[PDB]
Every structure is written in structure tokens, then in C-alpha cells.
Amino acid sequence: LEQKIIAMDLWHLALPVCEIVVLRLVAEGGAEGFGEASPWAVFTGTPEASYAALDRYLRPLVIGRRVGDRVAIMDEAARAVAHCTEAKAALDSALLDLAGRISNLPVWALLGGKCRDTIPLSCSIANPDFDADIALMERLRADGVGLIKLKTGFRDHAFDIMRLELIARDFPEFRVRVDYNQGLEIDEAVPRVLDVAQFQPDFIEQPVRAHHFELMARLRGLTDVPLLADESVYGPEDMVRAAHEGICDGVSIKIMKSGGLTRAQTVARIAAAHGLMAYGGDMFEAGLAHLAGTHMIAATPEITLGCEFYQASYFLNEDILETPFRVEAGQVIVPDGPGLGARADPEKLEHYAVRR
Amino acid sequence: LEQKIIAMDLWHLALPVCEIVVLRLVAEGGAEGFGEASPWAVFTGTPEASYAALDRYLRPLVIGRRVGDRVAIMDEAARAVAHCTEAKAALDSALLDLAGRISNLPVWALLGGKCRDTIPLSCSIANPDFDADIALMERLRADGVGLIKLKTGFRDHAFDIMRLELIARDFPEFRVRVDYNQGLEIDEAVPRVLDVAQFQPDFIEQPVRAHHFELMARLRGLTDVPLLADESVYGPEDMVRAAHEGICDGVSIKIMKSGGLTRAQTVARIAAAHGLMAYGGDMFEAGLAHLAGTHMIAATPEITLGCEFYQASYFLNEDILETPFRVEAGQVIVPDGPGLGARADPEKLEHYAVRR
Numbered sequence: 091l092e093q094k095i096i097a098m099d100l101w102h103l104a105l106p107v108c109e110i111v112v113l114r115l116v117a118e119g120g121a122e123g124f125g126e127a128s129p130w131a132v133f134t135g136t137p138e139a140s141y142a143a144l145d146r147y148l149r150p151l152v153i154g155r156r157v158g159d160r161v162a163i164m165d166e167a168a169r170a171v172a173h174c175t176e177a178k179a180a181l182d183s184a185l186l187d188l189a190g191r192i193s194n195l196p197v198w199a200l201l202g203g204k205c206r207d208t209i210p211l212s213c214s215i216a217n218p219d220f221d222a223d224i225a226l227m228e229r230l231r232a233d234g235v236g237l238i239k240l241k242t243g244f245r246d247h248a249f250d251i252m253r254l255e256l257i258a259r260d261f262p263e264f265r266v267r268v269d270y271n272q273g274l275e276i277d278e279a280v281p282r283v284l285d286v287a288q289f290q291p292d293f294i295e296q297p298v299r300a301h302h303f304e305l306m307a308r309l310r311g312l313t314d315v316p317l318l319a320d321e322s323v324y325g326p327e328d329m330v331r332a333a334h335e336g337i338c339d340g341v342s343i344k345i346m347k348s349g350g351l352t353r354a355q356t357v358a359r360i361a362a363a364h365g366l367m368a369y370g371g372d373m374f375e376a377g378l379a380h381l382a383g384t385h386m387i388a389a390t391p392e393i394t395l396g397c398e399f400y401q402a403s404y405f406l407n408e409d410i411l412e413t414p415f416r417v418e419a420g421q422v423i424v425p426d427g428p429g430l431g432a433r434a435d436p437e438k439l440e441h442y443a444v445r446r
Numbered sequence: 447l448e449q450k451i452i453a454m455d456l457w458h459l460a461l462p463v464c465e466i467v468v469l470r471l472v473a474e475g476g477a478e479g480f481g482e483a484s485p486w487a488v489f490t491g492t493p494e495a496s497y498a499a500l501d502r503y504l505r506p507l508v509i510g511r512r513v514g515d516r517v518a519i520m521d522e523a524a525r526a527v528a529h530c531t532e533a534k535a536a537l538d539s540a541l542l543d544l545a546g547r548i549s550n551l552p553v554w555a556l557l558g559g560k561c562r563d564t565i566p567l568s569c570s571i572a573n574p575d576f577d578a579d580i581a582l583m584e585r586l587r588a589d590g591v592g593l594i595k596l597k598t599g600f601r602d603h604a605f606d607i608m609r610l611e612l613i614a615r616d617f618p619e620f621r622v623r624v625d626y627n628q629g630l631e632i633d634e635a636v637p638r639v640l641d642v643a644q645f646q647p648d649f650i651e652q653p654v655r656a657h658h659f660e661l662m663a664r665l666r667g668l669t670d671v672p673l674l675a676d677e678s679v680y681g682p683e684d685m686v687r688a689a690h691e692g693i694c695d696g697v698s699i700k701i702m703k704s705g706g707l708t709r710a711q712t713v714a715r716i717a718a719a720h721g722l723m724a725y726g727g728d729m730f731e732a733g734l735a736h737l738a739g740t741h742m743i744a745a746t747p748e749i750t751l752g753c754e755f756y757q758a759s760y761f762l763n764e765d766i767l768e769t770p771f772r773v774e775a776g777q778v779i780v781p782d783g784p785g786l787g788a789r790a791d792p793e794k795l796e797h798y799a800v801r802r
């Protein structure tokens with residue numbers, strides 16, 4: 091691990107169904123590490139921002155550094171550029187993937203070990219054309235997927251209720267989660283949440299804008315259905331604040347928000363210390379990001395509500411991995427191979443790139 | 447790391463100057479892992495309690511497990527036996543040491559990498575015969591040690607003041623820290639702490655009993671000298687409570703309290719999130735425990751006040767490692783070799799054992 095990182099390559103991809111930024115690091119010894127940043131322009135930041143963060147601001151910080159100084163590198167990285175937690179997460183992933191390759195260890199082994207070999211998978215239901223999702227749900231049920239998360243709030247309230255009712259009638263096999271993606275306005279939050287809570291989903295995710303800690307805390311006191319914070323919490327700092335103000339019953343943890351795998355674990359551990367639950371959320375990512383999140387969760391017993399790394403299997407027309415992101419009988423398979431467990435395909439990276 | 451742990455050997459040692467419990471784990475392939483539990487009877491527990499914890503209660507959940515399932519093993523261990531955080535730290539150390547030997551990596555490499563190659567060392571000054579400490583301080587200054595921590599409260603207040611004045615006069619080269627070890631009673635806490643604070647030590651450690659959160663918080667508001675919590679904080683759970691009640695400005699982190707290296711890091715990270723400083727404390731341990739503590743601090747940027755792994759160098763007549771715990775120019779050296787960086791001497795373990 092005394093080896094020096096000698097190169098940094100980047101790709102700004104546009105995947106048919108979704109833009110992401112892929113990073114590759116190369117050590118003196120020839121080993122390579124991959125990492126993905128999956129920005130959501132309106133929430134975490136743009137792909138351009140993360141591309142620049144890596145290409146111009148973090149590059150000088152990483153090139154020439156020893157693979158083993160990851161802790162120092164990530165500490166400096168957080169301060170070297172503002173935001174771009176997706177880019178920071180990509181760097182951490184590549185650093186870990188690289189160290190894992192060098193030492194011949196899976197990433198979870200560099201995160202403390204593993205506590206689970208599989209992770210329950212959840213697929214989101216967010217199509218404005220519900221008939222298309224019904225067909226999707228038929229397939230999900232057939233594939234053994236047992237969890238689904240209804241994206242709510244993007245249309246009228248009636249549209250949300252309609253779907254919950256049909257799901258309960260024709261797809262009772264699934265456990266159902268709900269996610270508003272900060273979608274509701276102040277004047278409609280309470281009545282819409284209270285109505286949806288009647289359906290008793292496993293949890294309702296972030297009904298209002300991230301900065302609405304007061305309102306989130308109030309919504310939490312309205313029903314016994316768990317209220318999960320997502321956009322309101324990125325890292326440990328926000329988690330401490332969220333816990334203090336009692337804005338949620340649990341949190342959706344994403345490496346793209348925490349800016350790294352360790353910071354993601356810290357969020358989960360702080361949530362647990364406050365008696366709050368944790369879920370493996372994700373952004374609109376590809377298989378590389380899925381693998382990074384999978385290794386993180388495999389080493390974090392505190393995240394018990396499953397994960398939602400469903401895009402590579404049900405959203406993207408084609409993924410960027412050389413080998414399919416492994417999911418069997420509705421469960422994500424924790425890889426045990428070196429590094430992340432799969433390489434990104436250069437040809438696909440070259441083909442789908444809009445910039446590199 | 448898929449291979450199983452097939453054996454657990456224990457030694458309750460009595461080291462001339464100190465009792466500790468040493469643990470050795472053996473994997474199917476023959477690799478070994480060593481860990482140390484350094485119990486303090488009146489604070490953390492007895493060596494007999496920790497010996498029993500490992501020998502009878504943790505043995506069953508460890509034997510037959512995959513080396514790589516460390517996270518799950520430790521999660522289960524914490525609940526398998528009450529207290530005995532020292533035994534838990536020893537098990538975590540052995541598991542990490544074992545995994546390091548297998549993968550040929552330094553323990554810090556399994557804790558996320560490193561951010562520092564050396565750690566400033568502090569030696570405690572606690573001899574009731576102060577002339578003996580003056581001699582030691584002469585030795586300390588010559589060896590390049592620039593930090594010392596005065597053990598206060600075990601005698602009258604005059605004795606503490608006497609030593610603080612002589613140190614400032616004859617040994618100005620040292621940065622001075624103070625530690626009461628919960629030694630002060632309620633009716634004498636304010637006056638004594640105020641007097642000592644006039645000497646502006648770097649920090650004053652745990653003036654009163656661990657359970658006195660309210661009193662600790664009041665003491666914190668009396669001076670601008672940092673008040674460190676030690677016995678009041680063992681793990682993440684205590685750190686969350688201590689931060690909420692504002693009982694300190696910083697915390698002394700010890701693996702023997704946190705019951706593991708990761709838990710110790712979580713304590714440091716939580717403190718930092720609350721704007722509280724962190725110090726690398728220790729119990730009356732030997733070189734094996736010092737190495738575990740060194741690797742954890744090596745991977746934890748949040749711990750910036752140095753460490754006190756001085757016993758192997760200045761307290762124990764003889765250490766148990768095959769090679770000296772490295773300290774150069776008053777700085778602890780972070781090992782880069784496989785595992786903890788040194789091996790326990792089978793012959794010494796047998797010689798100093800009072801039970802095995």
C-alpha cells in the first residue's frame with residue numbers, strides 16, 4: 091500500500107433508460123480502482139460540478155499520494171472543494187477499490203468485515219404511467235423482489251392514493267415504502283402525509299424540503315408510521331443536528347450524500363445511538379455505485395431496512411459493469427472478490443461518454 | 447478471510463513494574479492474531495472478569511467463525527457478556543491482527559488507512575515519591591518526550607500544587623496535562639480545580655466520579671482550561687449523552703473502554719461533530735495494547751492531543767513483545783508491517799502467566 095497513485099481518468103456518461111461521472115485511479119503497480127458519482131442536479135449537485143471537482147480540484151491532491159493514506163486524502167478532499175459529495179464518494183470508492191485490488195481483499199474487508207452476505211432489494215415505483223409500473227411489479231414479483239418504494243408527491247394526491255390501493259389489492263406480496271422526495275409544499279404536507287400514513291407503509295421518506303427541520307419534527311409527531319429523513323441529512327454533522335431536533339425516526343443513508351463509505355457508516359452509527367433506524371438509499375446510479383453501497387452496507391449492521399440498488403437491474407437500458415450486478419431471489423449479493431467485485435467496461439465508458 | 451477461527455488461547459499475566467489478559471486466535475491456515483485486555487479493577491473491571499468473558503462467554507461465538515465476519519462477531523460479543531469492554535477490545539485487536547496477518551496488511555490499513563506516521567507521546571507523573579518522578583522527568587526530557595500528564599487528587603491539594611510549580615520551574619520544556627482520575631469529592635471539586643486551572647495545563651481530566659454529569663458540566667463552565675471526560679465516557683452511547691449534557695470540552699479515548707477499535711473511532715468522530723477535542727488515553731497496558739491503540743489513532747484524524755502509551759517504555763520492567771514498542775524522539779512510530787506490527791513472545795506469556 092506504499093504504492094503511489096500515478097493516474098486519474100474520468101468519464102461523464104449519459105446512460106439510456108441518466109448521467110454519472112466515473113473515476114479510475116491507477117497505482118504504480120498497475121492495479122486500478124473504480125468509483126462512481128451519481129449527481130442529482132436539483133439536490134446534490136450537477137454532473138459538471140462533480141466532474142470539475144475531481145478533474146481540477148482533487149486530482150492534485152490524489153496524484154502522487156500513497157494508496158494507504160486514504161484517510162488523510164479524504165480528510166483533505168472534503169476541505170479541498172465545496173459540496174460535490176458525489177465526487178468525494180467516487181474518490182473514496184476508487185481508493186478502496188484500488189486498495190482492495192492491491193491487497194486482494196473485498197472492499198467490505200477494508201470497512202471492518204461483513205455482517206450479512208445478502209441485502210433485501212427494494213425497487214422504486216415512480217412512473218407517471220402507472221400501467222407501465224404494474225407490468226414492472228409483475229416482473230418484480232416474479233424475480234422474487236419483496237420490497238417496493240412508491241415515489242409520491244410528483245402529481246396530485248389522488249394519484250398517490252390510487253396506486254397504494256391497487257398495490258394493496260393486486261400486489262400484497264410486497265412490503266411498501268413511500269418517498270416524497272421533498273416534493274410537498276408547506277400547505278399540503280400534513281393532510282397528504284396523514285392520508286398516506288393510513289396505508290401503513292413501512293416508512294414515509296422526506297415529505298418536505300431538506301431545510302424544514304421544524305416541520306419534519308412536527309410531521310413525525312402526527313402518526314406512528316416511521317418518518318425517514320433523506321435530503322435533510324447528508325453526513326454525521328447533519329445527523330447530529332437531525333437527532334437533536336428529533337426530525338425523524340430513521341434515515342436514508344447514501345454514499346453520494348455522505349461523500350464516502352466511512353462517513354456513511356458514521357451516520358448509521360450515530361442514528362443507532364439515538365434509537366433511530368437506517369436504510370440503504372441510493373441516487374440514480376449505475377452498478378459501480380451499487381457495488382460501493384453494497385460493500386458499505388455489508389459492513390454496517392445498523393442499516394437494517396434493506397437497500398434500493400435497483401437501477402442497474404430495472405432502470406438502466408444497460409449497465410456499465412463487465413459482469414452483471416448480482417441480485418438473486420430479490421436479494422443483492424455481497425461480492426467477496428478483490429476490490430468492488432467488478433470492473434467497469436472501458437468500451438461502455440467510451441461509448442456512453444459525452445465528455446472524458 | 448473466508449477461513450475459520452479454530453482456537454482461542456488465554457493468559458492472565460502479572461507483569462513486574464501490572465495485570466493484563468492476553469488473547470491469541472488461530473485460523474485454519476495457521477495464521478495467528480494477538481490482543482490485550484488491560485483491566486483496572488476499580489474502573490473498567492477485573493482481569494478475572496475479562497478472563498472469564500473471553501474463556502467462557504465469547505469463546506462460543508468466536509470459534510468456528512469466518513475471520514472476515516469480524517463486524518458481526520463484535521456486534522454479537524457486545525451483547526453476549528455484560529461489561530468487560532477490555533476483553534471485547536482484546537478480541538477486536540486479535541481479530542484485526544489475525545486478518546492483517548492473513549491479508550498481509552497493517553491493522554491501520556483495515557481501519558481505513560492512515561493520516562499520520564507518528565504520534566506525540568505523553569508520560570504520566572504519578573509517583574507518591576515525587577523525587578522519583580523528577581528523576582524520570584530528567585530521563586523523559588533526554589529521550590525527547592515533550593508531553594507529561596500529572597496525576598492529581600490522590601494526595602492533598604498542596605502536593606498537586608507543589609509538583610505543578612516545580613515542573614514549571616525545572617521542567618518548562620514539557621507541555622503539562624492534568625488528570626484527577628475521578629479522585630475528587632463533591633465538596634472539594636470546585637476549589638481544587640479552580641486552583642489547578644490557574645497553572646493553565648493543556649487540559650484537566652475527569653475531576654469527579656463518572657456518574658457526575660451535572661457536576662462535570664458545572665465545572666466546565668468555571669474556567670477556560672479544557673475539561674476532559676474520561677471515565678464518564680466509554681463508547682458512542684456515552685459520548686452522545688456527554689455531548690448533549692455538555693459535560694466536557696474533549697474526551698480521552700481508550701479502546702479498553704470502547705470495547706474495540708472501531709467503537710473508539712466512533713467516539714472520536716461524534717466528539718468532533720460536536721466541536722469537542724479527542725485524546726489518545728490508555729489504561730495500565732503493555733505493548734500489545736499500545737500497538738492496537740497506535741493503529742487506531744493512526745487511522746483517526748480526530749484524535750489530535752497525542753497519546754499516553756508510555757508504560758511499555760517507562761513503567762513495565764519488561765514488555766511481552768518479541769520486538770520493542772517503537773518510540774523515537776518522544777514520538778510513537780506507527781508500524782507498517784503485517785498485523786499489529788509485532789508479535790507476543792510465547793515464552794514471556796508462559797513465564798508471567800498466573801493462569802492460562
Ligand SMILES: [Mg+2]
Nearest residue numbers: 269271295320
Ligand atoms: Mg429519498
Ligand SMILES: [Mg+2]
Nearest residue numbers: 625627651676
Ligand atoms: Mg484519565
Ligand code: NA
Nearest residue numbers: 310311313314
Ligand atoms: Na411518530
Ligand code: NA
Nearest residue numbers: 666667669670
Ligand atoms: Na470552560
